[PDB]
Each structure stands twice: as C-alpha cells, then as structure tokens.
Write a protein that binds this ligand. Structure first.
Ligand SMILES: Cc1cc(C#N)cc(C)c1Oc1nc(Nc2ccc(C#N)cc2)nc(N)c1Br
Lengths: 552, 427
C-alpha cells in the first residue's frame, strides 16, 4: 500500500522557490490516458488532488511506450531537481563480484513501485504540483500533487534506500545470517539454508516489507539465474561479464574508438591479456567528437589479439574469507602489464591490466611496483585486505633498485616466480668514474628559432666530431650528443654534459621510452661495460666543456 | 552564556559551504575498529546517526597512537578547517609564544579529550558528517554527525580556549617561568629546568589537569623500562643550522674538483661569498676525470674564502605569517632524510636532516612519514603552524600507508614531487 515510515525532511537550495513550468496541451487521447492513471493513483493515495493557489507546476508527459498497450505517465522534474538541495549520494559504489562471499542459494526480489510506497516530506509536496490539460474548455485546472517519491525527482533514490534500510533493520536482526543487498529496485537475498528453509525466509521477509506498505510484484521470486546485474552475469560459482560484442568498421571515429576501449577495459576484469595502450593512444587531443581516425598497425593488431582473447569465454569465481588472496603479475609488452588474483590455482577471482600514463619514460622495476600498488589499492576495496604477491623479479634486483632510487617506496613481501620473462636491470651506471676510459665532453645546441642544431664531442685523447641536425630542439640535441658519444666510445667511457635535463633522463636509468632517441641510447647503454655520466655547469662556469660549447 | 544553548554560533565563512570529501576505503581491520569506537561514541552521545538530507562528508581514519593495542579514530577535518576556522583563526584565535621555540625542553601533552564535554552549535553539527565505509560497498556507509567539539576541527581549541585558560590558571601562577602553547589538540609545555626537574613540573600539571576535570595520556607511556624511545620529549635549544659542507680529501681527481665546482656554484642563490670563476678555470683544459689536479692556485683562495662563508648563516630571511610555509624532503639513503622549510624559493627559514637507522626494521615510507611528523612538530613550535609538504613519494602509495605509522592528531597538507636531480646534494 502506502507507508507508515517516517519521512525524511527536505528543502530547496537556499534562496530558491518551486518550479513554475506550464503544460503543453496535447492529444486528448493522452489527456484521457493520464486522467485514468491519476485516478488510480489518488485512489491509491499516491497522488493528491490540489487546490487553486499552489502556483508551482511541472510538465507531465504521457507516452504509451511502443509495442505495449498501457501508457506510463512521465513527469519532467529537471527544474525541481535543480531547486532541490543535494543529498548524500546514492551509493555509486558497486560491489565487485570477485568480492561477494558465497551463499549456496540466492533470491532476487523487485521493489518496483517501491519509490511510490515511501512517504514524501509533507511540506515538500507543494513543489510536486503538476497539471493535466483541460481539452480546451471549462478551463480545467485539473491539478494533482504528489504524496510519495515521484519517479523522477532528485532526492528520490537516496531517500528510498535510507527508508528501505531502516525497514530491513528489524527483519535483519532476527536472521543475522541472511545477507541482503539493495540497489536501485533490486534486493538480492541469500542464505545457507536449503531451498526449503530459505524460501520460508524470502516469503517471510516478503510480507515483512508488505506491512511496511512495500509491495513486491512477485508471487514467488522472479529470480532468473544467471543474474543480469550492472553488466555482469551472476551464477552459483561463476561470475562473468555480459556479452561484449566488439564492432568492426572500415572507418573509426573518436567516439568509435572510445566505446571500444571501454568495452575492452571492462572485459579486462577477467579476460587475461587484454591490451589497450595502442588503441587509446589513438585518442589523443582527440576532442573531435566525430572525426575519422586511421588505426595503426599497432591498434589493429592489439584489436586483433583482443578479438582473439574474447572468442572463448571465461568465468570468475566468488570469495573465501577463509583461504588466502594471491595476486601475480606477468609482463606482456610495450610497457604493458597484466595480472590476476586468486585463492586457488587455475581459477581466478578477477584479473586486470596495467600500462603507464603519458609519462615520458619508465623502467621495469618502477613500472612493476606501480602495478603492485594498483593491485593493492584495488584489493583493499574489494576484499578489505592486501594479497600475497608472487612476482617475477629477483629480490636482489629490487633492493638494488628501490635502495638507490631517490624516491620513497614500500612493496609488501612478494615471492619470486621463475616464469620468465624476468624483470631485471638491463644495466647500471658506474657511480664512480672510469680510469683509462676515454672522457667525452659532449654537447649539442639548436637555434630556438631556425629550428636547426648540431651535436658533437671532444675528448681527452684529442678526438672530436660534430654532426649536423635540422628541425630539432635544444633538447633532442643535448641527448643527440650524449648518444653520439656512446656511439664512438669504447667498451668503457666517461661522458660529460651541460644538460641537467639529459643528465636526469638517463640518470633515472630507463629501459623503455616513447622517445625513439632515448630508446636509441637505452640500446647502447646495454652494450657498454662501464658508463659514467657527469654534469658540469651547463654554461657559465666554463670548465672542460668550454671547448665543446663553441664548435658544437 | 551565548544566547544559543551553550552553542557558540559557529559559522562557515561567507559564500562557502560544507565539506564534501570522499572517504577512502580501509581494511576490514580498521572498519571494525572504527565501528567499535563509534558505537560507543553514539552511546556516550558524542555523535548521532544522520540521514540523506546531509550531503556533507569529511574523511576518517583509524590509527594507533603512543600505544600498540587500542585503536584511535582520527578525523581528517582539513577541508572543514579551511572552510570554517579561518573565520576562527580570528574571532576565537590563540596567540603564539615566541620563546617556546627558545626554551630548553618542551613537552607535548594531548588534551584533545576535554572537548567531548562542550556541546557543538546545533546548526553546525551537520558539517562534521563523516561516514564509516563497507567492504566492497556491499552496504552503505554508516553515517554519523558530531554533537560536541570534535577533535581535529580547529574549532574546538578556539571555542574551548576560555575554559582552558581558566584551568591552567593556578599552574601558571605557581610556575610562572614555564610557557604553555596550545595548538589544536596538544599542549606544548616548555621549561628551563633540568631533565627530571622539568619532568616534574610536567607531571604536576599533568596531575593538575587530571585532578581538575580532564584526562591526559601522552608525554609518555609508563614507568616500565624496556629501553624504548617512543616517549615524547623535546629540546628546541639544540636543533639549529645546516651541513652545507664541502668534502675534506687527500687525492683530488677532476671529477672530484669538477663537482665541487657546481655544488659551490649552486650556492649562488644563497651565500654571496663565492663565484668560483677562478676555481672553475683551474680545469679549462679537457683533462681526464679519473686523473689528478694539484693545489697551488690563483683560484684556491676561493675554496679558501668559500669554505668559511658557507658556515655563516645567511640573513635576509624573514618569516611572514601571511604566507604558507613549504617543506621539502629528500631521500638521501641509509635511512637518512634531509629537509628545508621555506616560504620563498632559496630563502630557507629552517633546514635539517631527520635520520633513523640504516637497514633495521624501518622502511622508506615509515621514515618519510616519520620525518614529516618530526618537521611538522618543529614547525608548530618555531612559527606556531604546520607547513605544506612536497613529499618524494607516489600519491597513491602514500595514501595507502601513511595512516600506518602515523601518530599525531593533526594532518598537515601535502602534495607529491619530482626527481630533484642535483638538489639531492644538499647534505
Ligand atoms: C546474490 C548477490 C548479488 C549482489 C549484487 N549485485 C550482491 C550480494 C551481496 C549478493 O548476495 C551474495 N551472493 C553470492 N553468490 C551468489 C550465489 C547464488 C547466485 C544465484 N543464483 C548468484 C550469486 N555470494 C555472496 N557472498 C553474497 Br553476500
């Protein structure tokens, strides 16, 4: 029926009054559609016929949704919803299946007219005033006012939940075992009692709601596994995602590609291996809602391989507060990483990927920790704890790494996983100089205007070289030069630059970079037996580079 | 006697509205702690449950203070503070004892307890709204709102100031040589006394507050000697200047002089005393790094003059209450961490070096998060206020752990920084 629930008080934004939008007369087929409906509502106490001076009005549309006999009244609240105070927002947070515990048998109810069974702050009805058209005669100010949560208003969702929550409470206390989840119009109820008993408790709760005026349009439970919830399919030992159909056009626009990454990322919750760097890379400054964008061999291939991973299904299992939580990571590519978290081998709870933001250059050790962090933050959300990490990196590679790394950091204890490819330091720089090794005073500059520049070196042995560079930056050259050096040097060497810039890009010891040139250097570094990099004052204090600055 | 029922009309600042900060999610451990803590609070009637007509929400964490058993709910009223209290850094503000930074010893006591007595403005209550979360949102947050001066919100001291002054009155009589500065939830008591002497003046006061209305836990833990160090005592008198020292060597190679050149150059936005034009040229040729260069110079009169000018503290640096203090920290290795507090680039007001171990049970976060706490405290003593940190750690990582080893009842403000390159060569 209706409800004995206390109402939640409401009010409009400070210094704002109710909406006064008038009605757009229409098909008297609809003016007669509504009238019927409104009557069935007022006879139900939902709506309330009002008087003369309730200034406020809000448009009421009436659409007989296509391929259905009945009509459904529709009130457009936009205005009130702009005049309504803000609420503690309706849990936007959705639980992740991988975090749902167990329960041998679940029932899903359907509190539909639900919102229409919860009281509406008395003093707040005024503003719900709406009117349905007078067939052009007798001037009907056929005016009705709402006495419940109008299926359109702002504080409707939240207030429903609150109201619902307060409701369950009593029932909840007599069955501290039955766990119930509410969200929108659903109410998932689950038990550890055989269908016999369990159904008693569902039928039970059922009436319990009914004494609260909450009518559940289900003689039995209209539950139909698997459950089609928030983009997932819910089963009795498996949870997965709903059909992820991946398009294939001869031409892709920005919104084309977007919707694609989307379906991809989401699919990545359980389809181990989904890559997406290349695709998304396409959408850059890509603020052109509808502008064709040619894919790249890279994008097509990933897209390909993604189609390949999708062609065969994969289920995810639920959770055991009793067993452990383990997460492993494996490297799969262009600075792309994938992972999966499980309690027992060969089944998963969920899976996921990880690539670096548009950040200049990275490194394997840095990146793997970055993944571990992401997994950690995620784990606290889903499970409320941190998993045991099994990682493909020797503990000595990481200490030599975290230890010498200028930035704080703390990764819980992991466990080495021989499963290559391993995460290793492809190289290290001599902290201390090199005796006997040639010393190169490296440099490169460019006219910040003419776009031109040159890179070249000078040695202790008297060797020198300058290479012409066009369309470059005072930057790309400072590296150019370092690179020129590494090129001509021998197995061992001492380079010296005026570029804290270049100094620091190499200093960090990257292995992968978006910048082909750096990758260029990264190559060479590998080969060197011992490389020592040093930074003397860029310009002024003109020491040994005093001579590379001029003829470069 | 404010017309309002003991409520001191509290009011957010003009054209400003309540805090709408997100609650990070915590481990089940903490959720459990927080629900136990709050269920009591509900019963002691300090907080009450709220509904949906409350858009407001300030974060809350669960930490462990001086102890290692019982947990503690630490609300993050940073946002609420910026939104109110500035209209309360004035109205009901509390002055600052320039000599405190001077005294020999300073001991900090936690009086954040008194507050729970004084009732909060019934109209402002709504802004203290905090939410206890659920694991995986399998339910909606538990929602509570304060009814008393909440601890953490810079309102309490302010409002409560009267009542304090009064209590402390007797003690300030007998002992008039001792300074007492309050800051939020702590009392900073300083004396010229000798060790155990001071620790007596404290314990008296401790007993003074304690016998006249208010509980007072930490300066320390207990008399039980296990050879620890978590007992909180302080000594403004020593902590002073910085090791902007050059190396003392026997065999100087080029690399060795080459650097010396740019480290001494760097200090060209600081000490005027040097420009090593002369010492720089001592290597105009393109000699070898590994190689060696001797002492006789036109230029060494510089490592001369400079090696001493770098020891006389630079003047021209002035605190400025209007400006925000900004602290920086560099990881230096061997559990060693340097730091500088400034207002205006290269005009360092204070520069130190918190260190712990070298490779014990400690770890990078914990130390960092310990150095911060240190620096924050020092700061509150000197200029009576917390600085803004530019922390050398990845946002997300700090957000996951700092709660851990965190101990103070205050949260400074922070942001995360880059690779200071050569700036790392500050020690
Ligand atoms: C079924 C359910 C759905 C949603 C949402 N959204 C949220 C909750 C809290 C649920 O209860 C639980 N269900 C299951 N597994 C499960 C069991 C049977 C069926 C069937 N048929 C489907 C799922 N395990 C749990 N630990 C919990 Br608690």
């Amino acid at each position: 029926p209706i409800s004995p629930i206390e109402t939640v008080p409401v009010k409009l934004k400070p210094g704002m009054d109710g909406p006064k939008v008038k009605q757009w007369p229409l098909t008297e087929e609809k003016i007669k559609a509504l009238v019927e409906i409104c009557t069935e509502m007022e006879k139900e106490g939902k709506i309330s016929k009002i008087g003369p001076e309730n200034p406020y009005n809000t448009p009421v549309f009436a659409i007989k949704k296509k391929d259905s006999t009945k009509w459904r009244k529709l009130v457009d609240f936009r205005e009130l919803n702009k005049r309504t105070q803000d609420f503690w927002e309706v849990q936007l947070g959705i639980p992740h299946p991988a975090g749902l515990k167990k329960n041998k048998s679940v029932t899903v109810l359907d509190v539909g007219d639900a919102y229409f069974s919860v009281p509406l702050d008395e003093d707040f009805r005024k503003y719900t005033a709406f009117t349905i058209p007078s067939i052009n005669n007798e001037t009907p100010g056929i005016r009705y006012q709402y006495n419940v949560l109008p299926q359109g208003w702002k504080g409707s969702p939240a207030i429903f939940q609150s109201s619902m929550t307060k409701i369950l409470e009593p029932f909840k206390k007599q069955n501290p075992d039955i766990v119930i989840y509410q969200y929108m119009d659903d109410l998932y109820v689950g038990s550890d009692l055989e269908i016999g008993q369990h159904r008693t408790k569902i039928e039970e709760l059922r009436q319990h709601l009914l004494r609260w005026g909450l009518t559940t349009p289900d003689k039995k439970h209209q539950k139909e596994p698997p459950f089609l919830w928030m983009g997932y399919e819910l089963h009795p030992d498996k949870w997965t995602v709903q059909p992820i159909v991946l398009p294939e056009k001869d031409s892709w626009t920005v919104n084309d590609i977007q919707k694609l990454v989307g379906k991809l990322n989401w699919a990545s919750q359980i389809y181990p291996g989904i890559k997406v760097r290349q695709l998304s890379k396409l959408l850059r400054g890509t603020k052109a809602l509808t502008e064709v964008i040619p894919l790249t061999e890279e994008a097509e291939l990933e897209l390909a391989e993604n189609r390949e991973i999708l062609k065969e299904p994969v289920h995810g299992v639920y959770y055991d507060p009793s067993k452990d939580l383990i997460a492993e990571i494996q490297k799969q590519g262009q600075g792309q990483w994938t992972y999966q978290i499980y309690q027992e081998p060969f089944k998963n709870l969920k899976t996921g990927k990880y690539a670096r933001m548009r950040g200049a250059h990275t490194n394997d050790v840095k990146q793997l920790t970055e993944a571990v962090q992401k997994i950690t933050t995620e784990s606290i959300v889903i499970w409320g704890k941190t998993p045991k990490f099994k990682l493909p990196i020797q503990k000595e590679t990481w200490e030599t790494w975290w230890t010498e790394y200028w930035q704080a950091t703390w990764i819980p204890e992991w466990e080495f996983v021989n499963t290559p490819p391993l995460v290793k330091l492809w190289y290290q720089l001599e902290k201390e100089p090199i005796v006997g090794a040639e010393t190169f005073y490296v440099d490169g500059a460019a006219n910040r205007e003419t776009k031109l520049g040159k890179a070249g070196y000078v040695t202790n042995k008297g060797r020198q070289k300058v290479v012409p560079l066009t369309n470059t930056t005072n930057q790309k050259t400072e590296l150019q030069a370092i690179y020129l050096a590494l090129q001509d040097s021998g197995l061992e060497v001492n380079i010296v630059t005026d570029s804290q810039y270049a100094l620091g890009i190499i200093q960090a010891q990257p292995d992968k970079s978006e910048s082909e040139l750096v990758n260029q250097i990264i190559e060479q570094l590998i080969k060197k037996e011992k490389v020592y990099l040093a930074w003397v004052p860029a310009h002024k204090g003109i020491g040994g580079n005093e001579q590379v600055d001029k003829l470069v | 006697p404010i017309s309002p029922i003991e409520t001191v009309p509290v009011k957010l600042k003009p054209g400003m509205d309540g805090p709408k900060v997100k609650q990070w999610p915590l481990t089940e451990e903490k959720i459990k702690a927080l629900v136990e803590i709050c269920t009591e609070m509900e019963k002691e009637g300090k907080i009450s449950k709220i509904g949906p007509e409350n858009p407001y929400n300030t974060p809350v964490f669960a930490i462990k203070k001086k102890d290692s058993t019982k947990w503690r709910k630490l609300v993050d009223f940073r946002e609420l503070n910026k939104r109110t209290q500035d209209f309360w850094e004035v109205q009901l503000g509390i002055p600052h004892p320039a000599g405190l930074k001077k005294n020999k010893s300073v001991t900090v006591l936690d009086v954040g307890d008194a507050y729970f007595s004084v009732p909060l403005d019934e109209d402002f209550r709504k802004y203290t709204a905090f939410t206890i979360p659920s694991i995986n949102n399998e339910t909606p947050g538990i929602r509570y709102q304060y009814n008393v001066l909440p601890q953490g919100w810079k309102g309490s001291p302010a409002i409560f100031q009267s009542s304090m002054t009064k209590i402390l009155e007797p003690f300030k009589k007998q002992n008039p040589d001792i300074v007492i500065y309050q800051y939020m939830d702590d009392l900073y008591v300083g004396s010229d006394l000798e060790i155990g002497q001071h620790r007596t003046k404290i314990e008296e006061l401790r007993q003074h507050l304690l016998r006249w209305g208010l509980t007072t836990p930490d300066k320390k833990h207990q008399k039980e000697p296990p050879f620890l160090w978590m007992g909180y005592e302080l000594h403004p008198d020593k902590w002073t200047v910085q090791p902007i020292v050059l190396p003392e060597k026997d065999s100087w190679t080029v690399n060795d002089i080459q650097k010396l050149v740019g480290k001494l150059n760097w200090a060209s936005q600081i000490y005027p005393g040097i420009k090593v034009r002369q010492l720089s040229k001592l290597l105009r040729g393109t000699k070898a790094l590994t190689e060696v260069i001797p002492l006789t110079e036109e230029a060494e009169l510089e490592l001369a003059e400079n090696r001493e000018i770098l020891k006389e503290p630079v003047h021209g640096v002035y605190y400025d209450p209007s400006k925000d203090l900004i602290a920086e920290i560099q990881k230096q290795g061997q559990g060693q961490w340097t730091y500088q507090i400034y207002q205006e680039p290269f005009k360092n007001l204070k520069t130190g070096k918190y260190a712990r171990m070298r490779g014990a049970h400690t770890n990078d976060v914990k130390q960092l998060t310990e150095a911060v706490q240190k620096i924050t405290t020092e700061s509150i003593v000197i200029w009576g206020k917390t600085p803004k940190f530019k922390l050398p750690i990845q946002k997300e990582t700090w957000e996951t752990w700092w709660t851990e080893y965190w101990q103070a009842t205050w949260i400074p403000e922070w942001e995360f920084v880059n690779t200071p390159p050569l700036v790392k060569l500050w020690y």
